């Protein structure tokens, strides 16, 4: 708008398009999502309103919901750059563990925050991770499904990735736990470790597939109840669980285990956020600064 100077754009969400934007007034520098659309609804308004009053050190804060002519404006305090950006930054290297161990517990703190008040992201992945000189990392772009569905493309019609989706989200489960979230983290911490994604899958059945050929596919043993989910067809083909230590070497036992437990295929065995922080793989965790080129 005219009360703010859109400085460049940062990219373009499932929801809308993000920029870097100053206040001509207070001189704040600012995230502005833009979101598209025949009135916007009138409950999403409350359920985003509601994100306004959620404040965690890691959790982007929101400041303003702005809603005028079909479009909706999302104010967003500013980070200098999301965790895709650094781990590619990072991939000749690799990030230390000492950080990735760093950054996995403080995202955690912020899920168990977001889970203890009834709030779930839906959506995480590396682009919607963002990070700062000070070590912090935090959870940005909330998806907002729970009030607008599941997102089919874009404005410039982009390609939604499914490398974070939930086994039971892609098995048609109507609905969503705290759990999904738990497993898209997962998939993010096993990513910082080898330096290549997990499940890079290219359509939603290869998703799954890439899932099942790495976990094993899944049967009522492990996953009670699995057979009867919406989308799951006796026909799928049966593979056998991969040795652990292959998935994500050279990541120690500590973290195999925790990784073991973020990725269970049953949603009710899976490990929740605040119990994922007494892993003993956190015994020794600290808070190291990234080398951050701005
Ligand atoms: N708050 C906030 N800050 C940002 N800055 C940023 C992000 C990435 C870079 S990048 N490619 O590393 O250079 C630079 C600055 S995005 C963002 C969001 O709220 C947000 C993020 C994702 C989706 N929807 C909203």
């Known amino acids: 708008m005219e009360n703010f100077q859109k400085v460049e754009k940062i990219g373009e969400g499932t929801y809308g398009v993000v920029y870097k934007a100053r206040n001509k007034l207070t001189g704040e520098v600012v995230a502005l999502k833009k979101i598209r659309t025949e009135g916007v609804p009138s409950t999403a308004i409350r359920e985003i309103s509601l994100l306004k009053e959620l404040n965690h050190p890691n959790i982007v804060?929101?400041?303003?919901?702005?809603?005028?002519?079909?479009?909706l404006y999302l104010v967003f305090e500013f980070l200098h750059q999301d965790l895709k950006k650094f781990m590619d930054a990072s991939a000749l290297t690799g990030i230390p563990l000492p950080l990735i161990k760093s950054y996995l517990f403080q995202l955690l703190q912020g899920l168990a925050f977001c889970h203890s008040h009834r709030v779930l992201h839906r959506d995480?992945?590396?682009?919607?991770?963002?990070?700062?000189?000070?070590?912090?990392?935090?959870?940005?772009?909330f998806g907002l499904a729970r009030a607008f569905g599941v997102p089919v493309?874009?404005?410039?019609?982009?390609?939604?990735?499914?490398?974070?989706?939930?086994?039971?989200?892609?098995?048609?489960?109507?609905?969503?736990?705290?759990?999904?979230?738990?497993?898209?983290?997962?998939?993010?911490?096993?990513?910082?470790?080898?330096?290549?994604?997990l499940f890079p899958g290219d359509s939603?059945?290869?998703?799954?597939?890439?899932?099942?050929?790495?976990?094993?596919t899944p049967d009522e043993v492990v996953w009670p109840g699995v057979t009867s989910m919406?989308?799951?067809?006796?026909?799928?083909?049966?593979?056998?669980?991969?040795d652990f230590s292959k998935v994500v070497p050279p990541l120690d036992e500590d973290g195999r285990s925790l990784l073991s437990q973020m990725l269970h295929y049953d949603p009710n065995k899976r490990i929740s956020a605040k119990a994922a922080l007494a892993?003993?793989?956190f015994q020794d965790?600290?808070?190291?600064?990234?080398?951050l080129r701005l």
């Open 61 to 71: 804060k929101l400041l303003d919901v702005i809603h005028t002519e079909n479009k």
């Open 279 to 281: 892993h003993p793989f």
């Open 153 to 197: 493309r874009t404005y410039t019609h982009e390609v939604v990735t499914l490398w974070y989706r939930a086994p039971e989200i892609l098995l048609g489960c109507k609905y969503y736990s705290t759990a999904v979230d738990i497993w898209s983290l997962g998939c993010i911490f096993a990513e910082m470790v080898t330096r290549r994604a």
């Open 230 to 242: 919406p989308d799951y067809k006796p026909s799928f083909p049966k593979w056998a669980r991969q």
């Open 285 to 291: 965790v600290t808070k190291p600064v990234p080398h």
């Open 204 to 216: 939603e059945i290869d998703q799954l597939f890439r899932i099942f050929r790495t976990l094993g």
């Open 124 to 141: 995480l992945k590396p682009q919607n991770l963002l990070i700062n000189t000070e070590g912090a990392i935090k959870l940005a772009d």
